Write a protein that binds this ligand. Structure first.
Ligand code: NA
Ligand code: NA
Ligand code: NA
Lengths: 307, 307, 307, 307, 307
């Protein structure tokens, strides 16, 4: 095979779309292999700029195509340089821009700890014809800085693995596995905006929903609970545009569920308190000891749910 | 005709847009036919990368164009390889990315069970000049995994059928039918998010709407019903952006209809209870036996509507 | 002139955007004219696939360009075949995809009855150099089926007319008129979703707004009317994203107007009832005979407005 | 210089985006200059269709590039004809489609009276090498018709002016000014939809906010004012998506401001009426003469604000 | 190296997207270097228009590619002129259009004072082979005018710095640093729209929330506070689409936080006032001296928070 050395530079990571679970990564790729010795004008290496490499490719120069596996849509490439040394090595430098995708598990939404994965693999040549020697990822632009609400932490993990493509074994009998480079960049979500915009207001809504039992008569406490459940419905919409549709529940969706449960349990308890009287003579105070028991049970529920 | 063998590899299915009834499928296509024996440099097969196939096509090589019938917009193709063996066969490998469309029947919205259809057909050569022998679809990347809220179940159904184009019979007298490959991938929607975000909150709203009859006087129960119907209007908006405009009613839209019906039937019954008095002396308890009859009728309605 | 025969095939009509008054039409166009006899390899006709027609065009073959007049944006063309018979005729087959536009009058919104218009006209050759003989439109894919909320009814109307371009008369003295093909496909909007999502809920809101006069005192009936007008404001937003900005009023906007009018007329009547007392001794029942007169006038208004 | 005559045809103006202050204009451009006499096949003029003009341009034909100065993004050109007469003149006909921009002053929003400006200027040749003789704009398609909510009024104003580019004076010593064509199309916004959707409902909200002073006690009138200010907040959102962010106030934003001012002045006046009692014995009627004075002052404010 | 002189002209800055922290800059770039003397037809300089420069580039002319570092997506270039003087200098004039990005710090949101940064750097040639001599930025189109809600103030700051690329040092031993031009355009946000749309309405909401303590009994003041907190929730949504997700709090988000704090502190104080009675005989006036103390503390909080 041909020993190909890659040096991926990351310019910036931007536009991390949580709803679509995609992100956009800019930067440069510098692939370098070796070939036969060639003659250049002077001792200096030749610079082959874009839209003119095609004359060299139609001349017979071996320029492989390196594609991104996990990309979404066509990667919007820009300028490209094919720098030709006369000692033998050929260097293909290109700028890439594309939307990449990952799994992006969302069990803990505001306190999330994710990673951004770049995958590179030759489109046509397998590991018997093109082998990746090593990659050095230069993430010095975003090594210790925060993009949007994501704090990039650590360096970039590099890994070279041989992926196997069973769909291509009908045209290649034995050699049908490809050398893939994986680049992993960790990212920790900053939870401050969610903490002061969704979590603590909903805690205040929960305390206000607890405040129904301090009232004195029945219609006023029903209207109190109903106008509280209306503003609980108000926060049901706000979370519909910050995280996608998930089979599980996150922290904020569990808080919405707890708000609905607290308010409707209060309404049912108030109804059962009102219809407690068989002949309309009994006072209703024995079941209304939930001024100091219902918040305690709610705190126990929250403490269990945190762990 | 020419016997063409296709091997479609599916990389990932993403972005299933329910409102537009489209979805995006990435992957590779490997078409393979046979031709005259040719000579290559060495015994090894020749690899013809992208943007250089045109020299071979202008030289006179037969490379058919395979289009997607059910695609929406232009399929955003990427890299392509035209691998030439010297024993005779020509292999056209290409990467595709495009938005596909299907019927996507939506009778049961959250408990839906749909399929994703890929259709492939030659654009110009009919079955008398190009015949699809067989297709093996390698859906091993998403064989037993869940994309977004869709759990992909089973393998990919393959079928080769001869479709007939009557619009082209004016230029082709007898042979005007084309061989189309259909690839069917089943998908079952995960109903959990809808279950805890729309169905059970609306059930709590229904019980709260039932709670009007436990009040004691008239103006308070009217205001109770009105502030309940306001939060029923609140959920009328939330469902407007999760499923498209349909002639029929789904489960959630039927629940909205049942909420409106319950609240307005309660308001009309309360009004008729108030105006039951001919001279203002009669008590109103005979018509207010719906504390234990109106929910029973609603449960009967729901049980009939489920089946 | 040259007699050109067109056979437009319609694959699917999708994405009818009411707010933008555009729609997207896929399918194929098959133009066919006649020319000098030519020699082909063998007796079989020659197939000229895409991205290779340019060699024949630079060789000197007459391939006219047929553009779409009413299209929005560039029509996203795909594959194209230039099928050359040796008996003389040249057949240009191409696939088109583009957003088309029409007037789309919206007097009756949910019970609308619209049409989809495709217009085709040569870009450069007038009727003295290129004449459309006839068109057969093969709308067999959507002849008797419903797209989105639009039921396609009937076949496709064909018409050939000579349009006149006065802007081009400075460069062409007498012959400056072009032969345009118009294809009309009727479509009837399915009114069910609007009927059970906007019309009947707003009727229930109207009846609830009528229900104010059954109350007994003043502050409660004002708060009743105010919390009803709030949920009338709630439906003012929902209709803002289903139909564009229009100088006139549709059915649903007239229902919103009637809701505002009913509620504010009720508020003004209640205020005038309260201030009817010169010295605070008069009872207010003479002006509150609108329990059986205000709905009757509203029904008369609606019956007049329907016709 | 070379005398160039332009004849701009306007097909349709669509998609006037008020928030972005852009609009889309379709149509054709017909540029015509004169040159050396040439020989054509026969006496007829030659038609040079698109994607084949490049052979004539590489042959040495002078085809200038005319760009649009005020365009947003790349103007999506379509088909183009380079019609060559043998008597000497060369005619460049092209179809354009692009998003144009203007200042679009918005002092009176619903009763606006705007214009749509098209600017054309050669990219490379100044007025010493290419001079625009005259332009005739053929706006006969939209001369007396209304697009969206904009009624196009009058014809199209034509003007040829020499614009000066000081950035290019380092490479051109004296001749660095360019001949620009400006095309002005007036448009009057139809105010009906805003009149019956925002202006008159907000007037009803204003009258309902005036209705607080007719109540009898304090808590009910506070809750009345609060539930009115809630639906004033409801219309604060609806206007956020119909006009962009502006330093000044339009008519509708002034109505929102007047609604907030009326309601909060009523609340402050009610509070000062309640705390008017030094010992709780005084009646509060002297300050509540605003049943017939507060609307009069509001009418004076509105009459001053209109002029 | 080669001395390259740049003269950037700015046509217009538009579409400053605060949520994405990007902006769009149109205009022209005029690069100019020197080379060997050449012969042109006549004494006049040669004009090389677009899509024909490639013949000169394949002939062997040195045209460097200048890229934008901070751009988002591919910069949508338009027309380009390569003006060749016979005295030796080569002038590359091109039009650019692209979305640029900056840090855009948002500590004070409505009273913001930002800058727009354009960065230009050769893609392939380092400072040993191409050196930027000087840049004159001609921002005369927007020198003293306001774009959208941004008032452009001052001229454009020019700076030439040598940036160092450590990722490219594996292919270049010592010379691996590039000359970058930075263009800084200051912009001050106009705070008027935010001042009369968010700041002063929320101040009125704060005063209305203070108004709870003037009521007389308990259930009415709870419902007062609850229906005030509902319209505080109403403004929590409106600010979600004008500024992005930030770790810190701006002015308006601090006002929302202060509104929630004031209302829930009032609710807690009212609850503690109600449960102040050990046996139900004590009057509650000592803790309700916050009619003249709670606003004073709130004013102290606001005065501290401003500085
Ligand atoms: Na309320
Ligand atoms: Na509300
Ligand atoms: Na919304």
């Amino acid at each position: 095979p041909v020993d190909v050395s890659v040096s991926i530079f990351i310019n910036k990571i931007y536009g991390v779309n949580t709803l679509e679970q995609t992100y956009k990564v800019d930067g440069y790729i510098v692939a370098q292999w070796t070939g036969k010795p060639r003659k250049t004008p002077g001792d200096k290496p030749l610079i082959v700029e874009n839209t003119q490499i095609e004359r060299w490719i139609n001349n017979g120069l071996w320029v492989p195509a390196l594609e991104f596996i996990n990309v979404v849509g066509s990667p919007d490439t820009g300028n490209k340089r094919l720098m030709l040394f006369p000692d033998g090595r050929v260097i293909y430098n290109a700028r890439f821009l594309g939307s990449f995708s990952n799994d992006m598990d969302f069990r803990l939404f505001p306190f999330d700890r994710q990673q951004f994965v770049l995958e590179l693999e030759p489109f046509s040549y397998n590991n018997q014809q093109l082998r990746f020697s090593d990659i050095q990822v230069y993430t010095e632009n975003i090594d210790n800085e925060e993009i949007d609400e994501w704090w990039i932490r650590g360096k970039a993990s590099t890994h070279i693995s041989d992926i196997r493509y069973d769909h291509l074994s009908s045209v290649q009998p034995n050699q049908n596995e490809f050398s893939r480079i994986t680049v992993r960049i960790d990212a920790v979500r900053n939870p401050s905006y969610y903490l002061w915009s969704f979590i603590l207001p909903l805690g205040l809504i929960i305390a206000a929903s607890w405040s129904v039992f301090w009232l004195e008569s029945f219609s006023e406490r029903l209207q109190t609970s109903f106008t509280l459940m209306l503003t609980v419905v108000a926060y049901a919409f706000y979370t519909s545009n910050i995280l996608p549709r998930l089979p599980y529940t996150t922290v904020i969706d569990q808080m919405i569920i707890a708000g609905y449960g607290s308010i409707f349990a209060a309404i049912l308890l108030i109804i059962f308190a009102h219809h407690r009287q068989a002949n309309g003579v009994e006072d209703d105070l024995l079941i209304q000891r939930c001024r100091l028991a219902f918040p305690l049970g709610f705190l126990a529920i929250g403490c269990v749910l945190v762990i």
